[PDB]
Amino acid sequence: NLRQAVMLPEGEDLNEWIAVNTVDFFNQINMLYGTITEFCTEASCPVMSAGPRYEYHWADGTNIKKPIKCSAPKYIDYLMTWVQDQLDDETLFPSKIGVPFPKNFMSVAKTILKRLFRVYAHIYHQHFDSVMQLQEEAHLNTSFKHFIFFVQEFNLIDRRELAPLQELIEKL
């Protein structure tokens, strides 16, 4: 029961819960995209997109403030390295029992989740046939559904970001 599994457990700390699931989703998505890289190439995906109605340009707001128009593999590389960095950052994601979560942690996590969604969107829009080819649709669908149930639970991604898969989300 996913709706149940995403709720804030008995006397748990919100930040820790979100931190803990965010790490897991990154891993899920990394795995899933990892499986179809052979089919996501600079040739197939010249610009990063969620179908022709949505095109994404990479910026992290610090090192790169002016969005770069790039291919899907490149955009996702930018993205995955970027998320990794954050998760490895001890001021951001404390693994010790001494560092608290920064005052802005929620905003940090929301930003990671916002962008992780785009990998799902690109996969569903552009590579679902490959996903079926490799017989990983069940893995993809359950992962996405889990991801969405969690963000809906804590209102972590706003509707206009989710729009490229609104129809798919509605059928969850």
Partner: peptide, 8 residues
């Protein structure tokens, strides 16, 4: 700057 460009 806007990271997402929408088209119709």
């Amino acid at each position: 700057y806007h990271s997402v460009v929408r088209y119709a």
